[PDB]
Design a protein around this ligand. Sequence first.
Ligand SMILES: OC[C@@]1(O)OC[C@@H](O)[C@@H](O)[C@@H]1O
Ligand SMILES: OC[C@@]1(O)OC[C@@H](O)[C@@H](O)[C@@H]1O
Ligand SMILES: OC[C@H]1O[C@](O)(CO)[C@@H](O)[C@@H]1O
Ligand SMILES: [Mg+2]
Ligand SMILES: [Mg+2]
Length: 477
Amino acid sequence: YPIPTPHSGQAYDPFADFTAKWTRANARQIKAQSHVPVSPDQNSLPLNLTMPDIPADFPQTNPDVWVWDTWPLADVHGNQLSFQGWEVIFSLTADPHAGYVFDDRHVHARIGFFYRKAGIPANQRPIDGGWIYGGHLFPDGSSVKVFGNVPMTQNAEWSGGARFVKNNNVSLYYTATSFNRNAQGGNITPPIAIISRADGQIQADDKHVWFTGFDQHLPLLAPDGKYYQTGQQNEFFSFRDPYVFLDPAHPGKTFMVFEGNTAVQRGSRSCTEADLGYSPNDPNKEDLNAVMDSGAIYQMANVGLAVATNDELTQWKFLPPILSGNCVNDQTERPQIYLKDGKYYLFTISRRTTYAAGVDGPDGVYGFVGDGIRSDFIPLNGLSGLTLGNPTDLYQPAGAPYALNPNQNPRTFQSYSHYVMPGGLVESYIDAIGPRRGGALAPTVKININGTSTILDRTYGNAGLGGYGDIPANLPA
Ligand SMILES: OC[C@@]1(O)OC[C@@H](O)[C@@H](O)[C@@H]1O
Ligand SMILES: OC[C@@]1(O)OC[C@@H](O)[C@@H](O)[C@@H]1O
Ligand SMILES: OC[C@H]1O[C@](O)(CO)[C@@H](O)[C@@H]1O
Ligand SMILES: [Mg+2]
Ligand SMILES: [Mg+2]
C-alpha cells in the first residue's frame, strides 16, 4: 500500500510557473482503497465513490439524436440560468439514422440545444426529462471556417461551455476539430483542434426557444508545443473543452481551464521523480526508469489555464498548466473550477483504459481541492483523486463499451462526462449498459463535497438516481 504524496493546497499567482502533479503515489491509492468484489457483486470501489447502477430500460433523450457531452446555459460564476422561464442545455449530437455507428459518431459531432419549461420537479416531468430538441445551434459551415483551406475529410464541434453575456447575449466557447483520415480511420495529417468562440442571441416566447447568429467563429487558442502538446508532437494529442470563468480572487480577469497534454515529442522519456511522487527514502518507491520502460511515458494528461488579454475576451494567452498526470493517465477531460466555501475544486473526467501501466481506476470524475486556481492541489478521497466512478472490478480486465468483458461489471462504462452543477448535482450521459448503447442523458446524482472528501448521496432521488438529464437552472437570466 503506497504512501500517498502529500499536498498543501497552497495558492500561487495564476501567472507563476507552478504545476500540481496528480502523482502515481496518489493515483495508486484508488486500488489501495478498493476491495475484491464479493460475487456475484462486481464492484471493487468504495461505496461512497460509486455511481449507483443505472437501469437498463433508460429512455432516449430524443429518438432522433445521439446526445453525449452536455452543458447548461450558465454564467462565468457557474450559475445555471433560465431564460424567460425556460431551462436550456447544449450537447454534442449525432444522427443515429445517418449510416455511421455509435462509436464512429465523434467526427460527425454538431452542437445542438434542448429546452424545457423551468420550475418543474424532476419526478413531475416526463421520464426522459422533457427536453425539446431545437436542432443544430450553429449554421451549417460556420464552424469549419476557422481551419481555412487545409486538407480535411471531416470537421466536428466538440465540448466547451455556454456563457450568458451586440444584440448577442450568448457566447459559446467550444472546440473546433478538423480530421484528415483514410477510410480505416488513420490520420493522413494530425487532427487540428482550435478552442473557438461564437456569439449569438437566445430568443423565447411561450411556445419555443430559438437562437440567431453564431455566423462568426473566432479561433482563440491552438497548442504551441511549449505548455500544450501539438499534433506534430503527438498525432493522438488532446486539446479541448474550454470552461470560461471569473475567479473572485482576480476580479478584472477572465480565465479558462481546458484539457491538454504535456508538450513533449511522443515517446520521450520525460517523466520525473516528482510525477512518481515517492519519498527518496521510501523503501517501497517505484523506479523511474522501470516505470518509463513499462510504457507510462504514453500517458501525459494536463489541465491548462489561459487568460483573456482584451476586455472583449476575443484575445487569450496560455499560462502554465495547473495539473499534470504524467506517467498516470493520458486524459484529464472537461476540467472545471467549482467554487465552494472559499475553496477551489478542480473536477476533471478520465477513463480506466488511459491509465499508465501499474496504475488503475474507473471511468468517472476526478477531483482536487486548493486555495486558488493555481494550487498545490489536494487529490480528494484519501489523496487519491477519485470523486465518482462507474461500478468497476479493478481486479479484472477493463474491456471496452463495444466489447464488454464478461468478467467485468456490465455497468463499468454506464456513464461518462460527469459535470458538477451547483449544490453538488452531477449530470452525465449513458455510454454502455450491457449490450445497450445510450447516447442519452443519465440520471442526475448528488455528491456531498466536504473539504478533502466526497460522498455519493444514496438518499437522493430513487436510491441515489435523480431524473434522467435533470440539469436545472438556479437563477433567472
Ligand atoms: O513557495 C511558493 C510560494 O509560497 O511562494 C510565495 C508566493 O509566490 C506564493 O504564491 C507561493 O505559493
Ligand atoms: O513530467 C515532468 C514535468 O516536469 O513535465 C512538465 C509538467 O507537467 C510537470 O508538472 C511535470 O512534473
Ligand atoms: O466527444 C469528443 C471528445 O471529447 C470528449 O467527449 C471530452 O473531452 C472526449 O471523451 C472525446 O474524445
Ligand atoms: Mg490499465
Ligand atoms: Mg468471472
